[PDB]
Structure formats: structure tokens, C-alpha cells
Write a protein that binds this ligand. Structure first.
Ligand code: 16G
Ligand code: 16G
Lengths: 248, 248
């Protein structure tokens, strides 16, 4: 009955929905990532604002793939920007996504994961459209409910999911808040990061397992806060350095 | 049996452990945050690397408290820094934590949440020690198992949890990886961000509910990606601007 327990039960239920409903889509996404690695492509992940956090959770990560890179749009990497409200405004700027994609090392055949809960703003929609125009395969992580219950803010009138090769439905109801209190007019307690991080790990875990099943050793990193982790990672990062862009 | 399902079941089980084991600690932490707001103090959250992501998840957040601020240590806000490996090295630098605390607006009586899974490195340990020396109340979000199974890398030989007023145990087993495959030597698939984000939301949800029960309207933000959210937030951010440091 207490707020902590109510929220955790809501987050568990959302993870159960993802587990039971997105299993095939999660498998398809992880296989696409494994295919890209095997065929010599690169892997990148992007999200704006708090959606950036699920993307960061698979980059340079204990237990994660060394080959996963972060696509950084300046000002929307998390909420670090001053003022934080500018991050919201940058999501409406046409041409930012193309500037970032055209400057990056992404090329035809690469894989880009795009996390956007609403999927409705110019920046994530343009990112998917332009990435596909460049020949990239695009996985979207998005709450498809928003496409029926909100209006697109992109000039095309379309949503992120309309421009993805694979869509992972992150389930969050419109408003991104799981609890209400009678005395309190606004809902509170967002689970979207709990859910999207879990989806991303499920996707990358599938890619690692798929490579292994094909007799290809997945390039996995260890935690740097367990003795020997940094030594282990140095070997891996050097080995796959050519397709890793967060070190040299 | 598939990797996605195995990971999601592991993450659910960790959320159940937090729900069933940390309920009283979560209540105590949220009450301390509510007490601080009521007594006129400020709220800040910090973590390094991927632990920064749980801190960011409660800042400028749909359904979250407008009064929660991010404490930014340059170079360890997420994994954005180039090269990402420098973030790991910065966690070992003595004096960085004090530099950041002494420059910030944090003052005696304020509340600081510190997220560190291992709790073993110089930066998070110094952050807690120096914050308490400044008169701050400190909530740590940390896997206490690390304090018995790893060695401290702080000069004191102590861990984060030894310097907290309240400890929230994030349960993750040493290594931060929930899956193994027979052919694959390293474990993979980290849940720490799934778990820590959920703990943080449970804490802030408790603070909002506690304020409400005391007849104090919690200063909650709405999603900017639902129509009217930015207008709603502008009112709130102006009202509580004096204790909000991510806008002006
Ligand atoms: C109060 C608030 O909402 N702040 C931002 C929001 O402006 C931004 O749009 C979202 C990412 O957008 P997306 O996940 O829907 O793509 O992250 C944050 O929530
Ligand atoms: C491969 C790797 O591990 N990268 C960093 C790690 O160096 C850092 O220590 C941790 C935060 O540390 P903490 O959560 O234990 O405080 O975030 C990331 O995992």
C-alpha cells in the first residue's frame, strides 16, 4: 500500500509485459545487432534527455558489448545541459539529427538503436528517417501507444515507429507516471528508464548469445570495479578498437 | 530459456528483493528528503559513470520532484567523456569530490543521495565523508555485498556505506552481470541501472507522498511530451526557482 511498493509492483508488471509481449521483437533486434557485427558493421545507440540513459547503459558497460557506441547529440545527452529546459527545446530543432549523423562515422549497413518514449518530436523522428536514408538499419525503442494518443510534432506527421526496421514497444502509458494520489493533481513516479534500460540489456544480451551460438566469441567487457576488470577491458578495447569510437 | 527472458526474470527478482527488503530503508530515505524540503533545505543526487544515470532519472523528470538537483562531477556524468576510460580514472582522484562539493550551493542541512554500486572507489567515498563534514545528510545507494567481498580503494579502507546516514542496498552481486553461457568466459547483462533507477523513483515517490500526507503539495513536474507539460513545468520551476539549480 505504501508508495515505494506500489511503484515497484508497477515496474515489475511493466517488465513482465515486455518479457511476455516483446520476446520475438527483442530476439529480432538482438539478431540484427549480431548480424551487423558479423558482417563488419558498427553499432550505435541514441536517445534524448532521459531516453539517453538507456543508450548509455549499454555503452562501455560491465557485462556489455564493447562494440556498442553512443551517438551523442550535444545538449541532449542526459539532462546535464544548462539550463536543462534547453534539452527539451533542442528536440524540436530540424536538422540537428542530420548534422550529427552526417558528422559521425555511421555508414550504410551500420545499426542504430533509437530510444524515444513518445516518438513524436522532430529530433528522434528525423534521426530515424535520415539514418534509413543513409542505409542504416534502425531499431526503435518507443511506446507505440503515443502514436495513437498524441499528435506528431514532426513536419511529416509521423512517429519514430513509422521509420524503424524493428520496433520495441516500451509499454509506458502516456504521461510517464505510474502513481496517483487523491490529494495530488499530477501523477508521479516514472518507470520509463527502468523499462527501457531492461529492454536494451535484453537486446544486447541476445546479441552476445547469438554470436556465441554461431561460434563467435562475443566481445564482452568486465566491471572495472572488480579487480582485474580494467586489464581485461584494455585487451578487448585494443582488439576491437577499429569499430570502437569512445577510446583510441 | 532465451537470454532476453532470463535477464528480465533476473531483473524482476532483484526488484522483488528491493521491494521486500528495502521497504523500511526506502521509507526512511524518502522521509529524510521530505523533511529537508519542509525545513527549507535543498536536494541533490550524484553518481559516477553509469551510476550517474539513476541520479539523472530523478532530475527534471516527468512525474518527479522539481526540487531534486544533479550534482555534476565533470568527466563522470554518464559515459559521455572522451575517452570513456578517463571516467574510470577520475573515480580514483582524491580531492575531486571536495572540489565539486565546495563549489556547489550545497550547505549544512541539505540532503545528498550518492549512488555507487561498488562503494569502493576514492571519489564516492570522499564525496560521502566530505558531505557529512559539511553538515549534509547523506543517503547512499550501494550494493553492500561489495564491502565484504572487495577491498576499499579509498585511503581510509572504508566503503560508501560506512559514511551514510541511510543505506539503500541495491543487491547486485559482485561483477554486475546476471547471465552466464557455458561457451563464454565472462558473465554478461547488467541490471544495476534497472535496479538503482527503481530504487531512486521509490525514494522520491515516498517523498512526494509524505509531503502530501502533511498537507504540503509536492512540487511535481509533468512530461514535456504531453501537450501542456512545458507550460505546467514553467509555473513550477519559477515558483521553486530559488532551490532549483538547473534553470533560472
Ligand atoms: C520534464 C521532461 O519531460 N524532460 C525531458 C523531456 O523534455 C524529453 O522530451 C524526454 C526525452 O524525450 P522522449 O523520451 O519522449 O524521446 O526526456 C525528459 O523527460
Ligand atoms: C566498464 C565499467 O565498469 N565502466 C564504469 C566504471 O568504471 C565505473 O566505476 C562505474 C561507476 O562506478 P560505481 O557504480 O561502482 O560507483 O560505471 C561504469 O561501469
Amino acid at each position: 500500500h505504501k508508495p515505494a511498493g506500489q511503484f515497484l509492483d508497477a515496474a515489475i508488471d511493466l517488465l513482465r509485459r515486455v518479457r511476455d509481449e516483446e520476446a520475438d521483437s527483442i530476439e529480432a533486434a538482438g539478431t540484427l545487432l549480431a548480424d551487423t557485427v558479423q558482417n563488419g558493421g558498427r553499432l550505435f545507440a541514441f536517445g534524448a534527455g532521459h531516453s539517453s540513459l538507456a543508450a548509455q547503459d549499454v555503452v562501455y558497460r560491465a557485462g556489455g558489448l564493447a562494440l556498442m557506441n553512443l551517438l551523442t547529440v550535444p545538449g541532449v545527452v542526459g539532462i546535464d545541459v544548462m539550463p536543462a529546459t534547453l534539452g527539451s527545446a533542442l528536440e524540436r530543432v530540424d536538422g540537428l539529427a542530420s548534422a550529427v549523423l552526417d558528422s559521425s562515422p555511421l555508414r550504410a549497413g551500420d545499426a542504430l538503436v533509437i530510444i524515444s518514449l513518445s516518438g513524436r518530436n522532430a529530433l528522434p523522428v528525423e534521426m530515424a528517417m535520415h539514418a534509413r536514408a543513409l542505409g542504416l538499419r534502425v531499431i526503435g525503442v518507443t511506446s507505440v501507444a503515443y502514436a495513437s494518443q498524441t499528435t506528431s510534432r514532426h513536419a511529416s506527421g509521423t512517429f519514430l515507429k513509422d521509420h524503424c526496421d524493428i520496433v520495441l514497444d516500451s509499454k509506458i502509458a502516456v504521461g510517464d507516471a505510474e502513481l496517483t494520489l487523491d490529494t495530488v493533481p499530477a501523477p508521479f513516479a516514472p518507470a520509463s528508464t527502468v523499462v527501457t534500460a531492461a529492454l536494451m540489456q535484453a537486446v544486447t544480451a541476445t546479441a552476445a548469445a547469438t554470436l556465441a551460438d554461431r561460434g563467435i566469441e562475443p566481445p564482452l567487457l568486465r566491471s572495472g570495479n572488480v579487480d582485474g576488470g580494467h586489464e581485461w577491458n584494455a585487451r578487448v578495447l585494443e582488439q576491437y578498437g577499429e569499430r570502437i569510437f569512445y577510446r583510441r
